Amino acid sequence: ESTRNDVAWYARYPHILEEATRLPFAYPIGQYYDTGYSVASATEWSKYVDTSLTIPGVMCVNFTPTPGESYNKNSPINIAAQNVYTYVRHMNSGHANYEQADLMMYLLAMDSLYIFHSYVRKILAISKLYTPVNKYFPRALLVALGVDPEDVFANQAQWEYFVNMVAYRAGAFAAPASMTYYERHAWMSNGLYVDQDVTRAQIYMFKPTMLWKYENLGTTGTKLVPLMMPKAGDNRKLVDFQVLFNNLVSTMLGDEDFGIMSGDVFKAFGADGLVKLLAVDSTTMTLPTYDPLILAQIHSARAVGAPILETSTLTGFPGRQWQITQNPDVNNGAIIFHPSFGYDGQDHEELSFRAMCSNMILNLPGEAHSAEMIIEATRLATMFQVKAVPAGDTSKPVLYLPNGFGTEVVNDYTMISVDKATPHDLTIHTFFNNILVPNAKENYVANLELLNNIIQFDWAPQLYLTYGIAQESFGPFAQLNDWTILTGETLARMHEVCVTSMFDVPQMGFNK
Amino acid sequence: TEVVNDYTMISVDKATPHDLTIHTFFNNILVPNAKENYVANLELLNNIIQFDW
Amino acid sequence: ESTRNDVAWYARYPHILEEATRLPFAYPIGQYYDTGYSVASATEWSKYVDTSLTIPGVMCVNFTPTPGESYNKNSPINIAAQNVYTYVRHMNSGHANYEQADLMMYLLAMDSLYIFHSYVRKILAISKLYTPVNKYFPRALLVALGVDPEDVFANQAQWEYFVNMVAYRAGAFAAPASMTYYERHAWMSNGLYVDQDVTRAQIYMFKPTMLWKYENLGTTGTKLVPLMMPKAGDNRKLVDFQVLFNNLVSTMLGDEDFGIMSGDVFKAFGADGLVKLLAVDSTTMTLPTYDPLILAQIHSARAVGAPILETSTLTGFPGRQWQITQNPDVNNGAIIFHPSFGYDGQDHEELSFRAMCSNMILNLPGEAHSAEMIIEATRLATMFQVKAVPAGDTSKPVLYLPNGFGTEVVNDYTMISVDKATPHDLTIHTFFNNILVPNAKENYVANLELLNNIIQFDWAPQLYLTYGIAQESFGPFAQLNDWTILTGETLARMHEVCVTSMFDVPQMGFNK
C-alpha cells in the first residue's frame, strides 16, 4: 500500500461492491473446465480460440535406490562396509563365513524390501482418500503408482493383509535402525507432498523405478540386479505385487549366508536396534503434508534416464547393464556400482540429453540458506561428466558417466492430468528434465500444454527443451529465486558427504 | 644408527579407477630421454614439494 | 616431541656436543657458493656432479594498470564515470564543455603519473640500500626495474630532484584522494616485499610494464595508448626517464579540456581532498616489509602476456592493440577497454598458453579465510574465457578474451639471480606462468634451475609447464595448503566487486 489510500466510495457503498463482485473461487481440481467464449461468433475459429482449462494433480518422481558410484575400495559404500563388518564380525563375536562386502550387499538388499513395503502401504493408504475439492483422489495417485484403482477398492482387505504380511516376513532378516539410509528411503517413498500448502494443491510422490534383486553366484561373488516396478499405465493387481515380492525374497529366505548374516546383525545390534516395519490397520490413512525440504530436492532434480537391463539392446554398448557387483578377484574385492546414464529405453540417441551437459543451477527459496538446506536440495541432482566410450565402429545411443550421485537417482517423472478432449479422462505424461520437440505440427501445442501443466507445480524440476527444427536447446525453464551455478566437483563433494552420512551407524563404537 | 635406503611416496592416480600409486626413489633421480619420463618426473617433483620438509 | 625424551648424554657432555656441531649458518645471499666434492675423484664426472648453489634474490612482477574490461555502458568504469561526472558537474557547479567519459579518462591518465612518480621514487630509495647479509642490494633491484645502477649512484642528487619535480608538476592536475585506485597502485608500486620475513629474504617488487599516454583526437574522441616502461636489462639513465615523463605529460599540460577538468575537480573535491605526492629528501629510505596480502595476491597471479601495440605484428589479428577508447558515436559513448591476451611479443603462437585454459586454483595460507583475504588474493588472477576470432584464413598467434580482470593485470615476471658459471654475474630470467620447454638438451637443466629458483620464493606464482617432447602440459607447480577450484564467473564477480570498490569516491554525497 504505497500511495493508495482508498476510493472511499466502496466504504459508503459496500453493498453495491458486494453484489458486483460475488464470484465462486473454489473450483474442484480433477475435472475439465470449459471457459466459454467471450466473443460468441468465435466458433468459426475452431482451434484459434482455446476455451480449455486443465489443472494437473500428480507428479510422481520415479527413482532408483543407489549406493553412490563405487568404483574402487575408497568408495563411501566400501568404507561403510568395512565399518559394519568391523562392528558385526570383530567388535561382536560374529561368524567367519562371509566377507565385508557380503554384509553390505545384504544390507542393500534389505532396503529394497523396505522400499517395497513402503510402496505397497502407500498404495493401500491412498485408496481411502476421497475429497470433494480434489477429484484426482485416489484414482490419479493409484494410476501414477501403476496399480488398477478398482483392484485396490474391491480387494482392500487382501491388500492390507498383504502389506502386513510383507512387514511380518521382513522380520526374518535384521538390519540396523540407525542407518539413516533406510529411514530416508522410507520417508521419501511413504508420503504425499503438496507443492504450496493449499486446499486444491498439487501432489508430489516418489515411486521406485526398480528395486535390487539379490542374485547369488558361486565363488564368482554376489550381485544385485534390477527388479522393475510397474509403470503408470500398467493396471497391476495384487497378484502382480505378490509375484514381485515373492521373487524379491526368493533367493533371500533360502540362502544360508543370509541366515548367518541375519543372526549376526541381530546379535550385534540387539532387537531394539533393528528396523521395524510397523503394522497398519483399517484406520491407517496417510495424509498429504507440506515439506519444504522435499520440494527443495524435487526442484533441483536431474533425471538420468532409464535403467539398463541385461535384455536392453544398446548398439555399441554391450555390457553396460546396471548392477551392484562384487568379485573377490576383481578390483580387490570391492563393491562396484558404476552405471552409464542417458538411456531412454530405445536403441537410438535421445537427442535432448545433450542439453543436460551444461552445469546445473541450484535454485533455493528465500535469501538465507542453511548448510543442511543446501545439502538436502542437491540429493536428486546428478550431473554428467563424460561420454561413455563405445565399443566398435558405430553406436546408436550416447551414454554418460557421472561425477558422483546421491543415495538415489531420478529416472524420470510422470505427470497425471485430465484430458482437454472428451471424455476428459486421465492423461499420463512421462518425461525427463530434457524434452525433445520434433519438427511436426502436432508437437508444439502438446509441448506448450506440458509446459503449462509443469509450471502449475510449485517447486517443479527445471526443464531443458531441445527443438529439432532449430538444432538448439534452451536452458533451465524455471523461475529462479536465489541460485548458484554448481560444477561437478562441488556436487561430488556434497554427494560424498551425504552418502557417508547415510551409511553411518551411530549405534557402533566408532567415535563414541 | 640408521641409514636411509629409499623413500616411497603414495599418491592417487589421475586415470580411472584412481587407485593408489607407489613411487620409490632415492634422493637422486635419473630422467632418461623419453617423452614418458619428463612429465612423469615433473609430476613426481610436484608431488615431492607438497611435503614440507 | 611425541615420545622422544632426550639422549641425556648430550646434557652431561655438552662441550663435546658444542665443538662437534659448530657450523656457520648465515651465508650472505647475492653471491655464488661452491659446495665442493664429497668424493674427491668425482671431477672425472664433469656435469654429473653439481657443486653449484645459487639463491635468487628478486622477483619483479610486471603489471599493467587497467580499468577492468569495459565493453558496454553497464561496466564498472562507466558507472564510476557517471557518478564522478554527477558529483563534479551537477552536485558542484562545474563546466559543461566535457562529458562523463572525458573526466574518467582524465582520472585514468592521472594514475599513470602517480605510478610513474612511485616508480622513480622506488628507484631513488633502492639505491641507498646496502647490507652485508644481502649482496643483491641494490644492484639486482635496480637492474630489475630497468635502470643503470651506476647512473643512480653517480647522479643521486639529479635523480632525487627529478622525483621531487615530478611530484611538484603533478600538482597542476587534480584527482580525488578517496579513490582507493590511486592508493592501491601507489601502495603496490612503492614497496619492497619479503617472502617469509627473515634476514636473507627474497624480495618481491611491482614494476609497470607500460603506462597510459593520453592521446587527444578531434571530435573522434579520446584515447589512452600504451607508453612502454624499460625492461630489466635496458640500463636506462635519468635522461630516458625524463623523456618518458615529458612525453607522458606532453598532451596533458597544453590541453585546455584538462585545465577545465582540473579546475573542476579542484573546486569539487577541495584542496585537502586531492591526491598529494609527498616530497622526498636525502634521508628518505624505503625498507623491505612483510605483507601477507601482497604475497596472497602474488601467489594467485596469472600472467596475461605482452601488451599489443600498434606496431606489433600479429598475423590474423590486425586491430587488436590495447587501448582505452571513447567515441560518442560508437557504443553509446562508453569507455571501451577490451584487450586480447596471450601475446608473447612475437608473430607466432606461444604454445604454452594452452596450459592457462584450465580453471585456476586459489591457494591460501592457514585454514580460516576472511572475505577480505579472498577478495585480495584474487586481484592479479586473470582467467581466459574464449579464443579471439582471427580475421582471414591463417593466423599465427592465438589470442584470448578474458572473463573480467581486476584493477591491474600481470604481464610477466622477472627473476634476478646469480649465474652458476663464472664470473657469476646477475642473470635475468623473464617468464609467464606458462613456460614452454622445447625439445633440446640445453633446456632441461635450464628449466630445472629455473624451477628451483622459483621454489625459493615463498608465495611464488603457480607455474604451468608444457613439454614439447611430450605434447603435454603439467598443471599447477606449487605447494598447496587450503585451496579451491575457481571458475570464471566467480572470479568475474570478485573482479566486479573490486573494480566497483576501487573507483568509488566516499567524498561524494552518494549514500551518505
Short mmCIF file of C-alpha atoms in Angstrom, two decimals, chain A residues 71-72 332, chain B residues 17-19:
data_model
loop_
_atom_site.label_atom_id
_atom_site.label_comp_id
_atom_site.label_asym_id
_atom_site.label_seq_id
_atom_site.Cartn_x
_atom_site.Cartn_y
_atom_site.Cartn_z
CA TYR A 71 34.49 -47.88 -8.48
CA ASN A 72 37.32 -48.54 -6.01
CA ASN A 332 40.48 -56.03 -4.62
CA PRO B 17 39.76 -46.00 -11.34
CA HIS B 18 42.01 -43.51 -9.44
CA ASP B 19 43.68 -46.17 -7.30
#
